[PDB]
Amino acid sequence: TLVASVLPDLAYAELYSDPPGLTPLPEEAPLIARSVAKRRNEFITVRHCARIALDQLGVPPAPILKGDKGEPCWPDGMVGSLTHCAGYRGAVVGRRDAVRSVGIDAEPHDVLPNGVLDAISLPAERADMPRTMPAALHWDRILFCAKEATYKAWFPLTKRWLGFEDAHITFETDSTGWTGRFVSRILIDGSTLSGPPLTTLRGRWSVERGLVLTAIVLAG
Numbered sequence: 001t002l003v004a005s006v007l008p009d010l011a012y013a014e015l016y017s018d019p020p021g022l023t024p025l026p027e028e029a030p031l032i033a034r035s036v037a038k039r040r041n042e043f044i045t046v047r048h049c050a051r052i053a054l055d056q057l058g059v060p061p062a063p064i065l066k067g068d069k070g071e072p073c074w075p076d077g078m079v080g081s082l083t084h085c086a087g088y089r090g091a092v093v094g095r096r097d098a099v100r101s102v103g104i105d106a107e108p109h110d111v112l113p114n115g116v117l118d119a120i121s122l123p124a125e126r127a128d129m130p131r132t133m134p135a136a137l138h139w140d141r142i143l144f145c146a147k148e149a150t151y152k153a154w155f156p157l158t159k160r161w162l163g164f165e166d167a168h169i170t171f172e173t174d175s176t177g178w179t180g181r182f183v184s185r186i187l188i189d190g191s192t193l194s195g196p197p198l199t200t201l202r203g204r205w206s207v208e209r210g211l212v213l214t215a216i217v218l219a220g
């Protein structure tokens with residue numbers, strides 16, 4: 001799988017298309033009743049992936065509903081993250097006793113649309129990241145993906161907004177050239193609903209098959 005290359009009580013599942021036959025669980029069906037086909041397909045497929053991952057940890061097939069801000073609602077004692085983009089649906093789930101939080105993101109490995117890099121990056125990131133990343137890789141898109149995994153790991157623990165300017169992310173590249181590590185440093189107050197405050201979040205990135213994947217797994 002693609003997500004295994006960005007991961008270190010934890011399970012995952014991913015699909016690259018929307019298989020025929022899959023349906024939402026009855027409890028999930030109202031959430032996409034008036035949604036277009038592209039949205040229903042990604043919603044149904046990513047939650048099938050979530051249930052495949054949850055099954056590996058011994059959780060019965062459960063619906064994945066949404067919270068007030070759209071965040072996924074996991075079964076008791078579980079945490080996880082979902083992502084879907086063109087050609088990718090992915091889920092990573094963990095047991096809360098050992099895994100405090102998970103955040104993952106996937107995006108096509110393409111240059112960012114005009115003007116978006118400046119809206120999602122800090123000046124030091126634009127200056128330093130091209131020097132730590134392999135030539136010709138879309139480091140701007142990889143930066144955006146790391147910001148998204150950071151927010152997805154952050155929000156279940158804080159229930160607070162995190163802006164793109166509120167996290168400074170530094171990168172390293174493995175010897176292979178297409179995978180590496182990152183560290184996201186939270187610049188604002190990192191107080192959480194329970195447990196110690198969030199300061200630095202360590203994650204991994206990977207470019208493979210036209211996709212960028214990022215994941216953060218915070219140990220309990």
Ligand SMILES: CCNC(=N)NC(=O)Nc1c(C(C)C)cccc1C(C)C
Pocket residue numbers: 147148150151152162163164167
């Ligand atoms: C480092 C801080 N990152 C963020 N706040 N990211 C987002 O809000 N992404 C996002 C966005 C952004 C691009 C505005 C739109 C819809 C859904 C999402 C989810 C991933 C929550």
Ligand SMILES: [Mg+2]
Pocket residue numbers: 083084085
């Ligand atoms: Mg998506």
Ligand SMILES: [Mg+2]
Pocket residue numbers: 083084105106148
């Ligand atoms: Mg995303």
Ligand SMILES: [Mg+2]
Pocket residue numbers: 108109110210
């Ligand atoms: Mg492509």
